[PDB]
Structure 1
């Protein structure tokens, strides 16, 4: 894989990221807490989002212009994307009352952390702009990158807002769980930061700043992002936690999941009442009841049929909109998620 070939170097750059962010002795204790937050949260993942920056940079920039300093900036912008995601996940885990993430207990669930994690999450976000300034201040794409990361934060936060509004705690209303709402949540909430942001960063780094090029790129990447969140919802309930590294909470959290949307599209009036009585509640028995209904409506086969249809749809979109970028930029990402 083109990701496996660049992974080792990317992960080894993390030490430099941390050292640079850790180097006024009065704030030494705060800096040690930042190091602890960085090391706990921005490490233990697959680093696919950050790697997508590095890989896309190598495919878009002329090898002659891929010098030691330009590669360093690519690895740094890659780590900036991982830091953005670390910021969102630390905060999303509090708001979703999650237990584990990347095989360990959620940072806020750690004794002595608690709601202090809210500030820790904001520090991770601040670190992006610290790194963009330290490594890209003198580059012509500097402001493009600042604006792209700020826009990515706004889009995700709007998406998280739709997510929380559609999922009110202890307010069970399935009328809100529609396909139109679902696609809107995921587009803003996941698709921009997970797929548009990494490729767009490498594009700007390669001097590709044209609105039309970014629009064409966005058409493919937002559609891949939608499949990716549908996969995330599927794995929340039917995935193996020893593989996902996290425990699913969508049913207990009354989330507008792809699965509840598909359940509602296929449920008889009798099945609708079962779901109405058991969804969005903490009881193990009620959550087990919902999973049984999903299994009875054969949603895992519906997801597998969707994964196939989605893949063929995204491939058709790469054929239509990849030009003038190398199709490999999008094919490498499509192989990693499908």
Structure 2
């Protein structure tokens, strides 16, 4: 689906850039914007953008899929990638990250620094420029502008909650209710709801009820994805994933610590109070081994089965009238 549509998606990028990087004296700014687009919108897996394109094909009767409709699908997928890029560039400055996608974070490059704040705003702005240029005449134009704006806001407000929740190792902040709330707003809305919802609108499916039904399935898939992402940060083999995890060094509200704290005798709370959020490795070793000693690998395994049963019921209940394959194709990318 994705294996076999990733090709035209990445080749489209070059057109995306052409049309955004066309008024003599603004030239130098426009060159900078090109360098920003190139460094930051390229080099991920493109799962979110591609989901737009795949879902567009599944949703539109194939006799309403001319060259220009496809091109709008490619474009809106690239909009989702640009929203991703905006959030990351800015999040990397906020967290003080060193690398991203296997390279030096844009803000850490020589003579970029905090100028990356403007660069990131430009990435966001490019979303609406593309939507104007390619979709202004379409009946779903407004629908999409609102979708992207709301996705930004949800993701922003989730970032606030995350930042309040994890500055300083106060583990009383790290609750289940709070973990779930952070994942929904910061991650799931834009990563899972947004791309399918966009394809929906592009197909004419604008009903509030249809969107709510898809949302219900897709926010739940997003919660599982992040939960598996947190497991793997620590237990994932690093040559299968790519990441090597610093969740624990960074005092993250990770599903692991949440579960751990649900399960600990008061003596264990202490070992964790003493090791959570530390630089030193031995004190990260002894967090791992405390998680191992509470069979969190196994709780996760149980959680993962339960979750899969749940998603399948959701799809059975709430997919109609969309093709269950829209959702199943996504479920297969994450439950693998």
Q: Shared topology, TM-score over 0.5?
A: yes
Aligned residue for 2:144, secondary structure, equals: helix
Change (3 A) 1:238 1:177: same
Q: Give the Å deviation of 1:114.
A: 1.8
The equivalent residue for 1:219 is 216
Query: Alpha-carbon deviations, 1:194-233, whole Å to 9, x = none?
Result: 0000000000100111000000000100000100111221
Aligned residue for 2:25, secondary structure, equals: helix
Aligned residue for 1:253, secondary structure, equals: coil
Q: Is the 8 A contact 1:99 1:105 kept in 2?
A: yes
Inter-partner Cα distance in structure 1 for 2:182 and 2:80: 20
2:246 maps to 1:285: no
Change (3 A) 1:42 1:246: farther
Inter-partner Cα distance in structure 1 for 2:282 and 2:89: 28
TM-score by length of 1: 0.95
Aligned residues: 335
Q: Is the 8 A contact 1:99 1:247 kept in 2?
A: no
Change (3 A) 1:257 1:189: same
Inter-partner Cα distance in structure 1 for 2:278 and 2:117: 25
Query: Alpha-carbon deviations, 1:144-165, whole Å to 9, x = none?
Result: 0000000000000111111111
TM-score by length of 2: 0.96
Q: Cα RMSD over matched residues?
A: 1.4
Q: Is the 8 A contact 1:101 1:245 kept in 2?
A: no
Of 207-216 and 84-93, the range deviating more from structure 2: 84-93
Larger RCO (CA under 8 A, 6+ residues apart): 1
Aligned residue for 1:8, secondary structure, equals: helix
Structure 2, unaligned runs of 5 or more? none
2:330 maps to 1:333: yes
Q: Is the 8 A contact 1:100 1:246 kept in 2?
A: no
Of 240-249 and 262-271, the range deviating more from structure 2: 240-249
Of 47-56 and 102-111, the range deviating more from structure 2: 102-111
Q: Is the 8 A contact 1:7 1:51 kept in 2?
A: yes
The equivalent residue for 1:7 is 6
Q: Give the Å deviation of 1:269.
A: 1.4
Q: Give the Å deviation of 1:242.
A: 4.6
Q: Is the 8 A contact 1:86 1:121 kept in 2?
A: yes
The equivalent residue for 2:202 is 205
Query: Alpha-carbon deviations, 1:117-140, whole Å to 9, x = none?
Result: 221111111110010001001100
Q: Is the 8 A contact 1:50 1:79 kept in 2?
A: yes
Aligned residue for 1:207, secondary structure, equals: coil
Structure 1, unaligned runs of 5 or more? none
Q: Give the Å deviation of 1:243.
A: 4.7
Inter-partner Cα distance in structure 1 for 2:173 and 2:287: 17
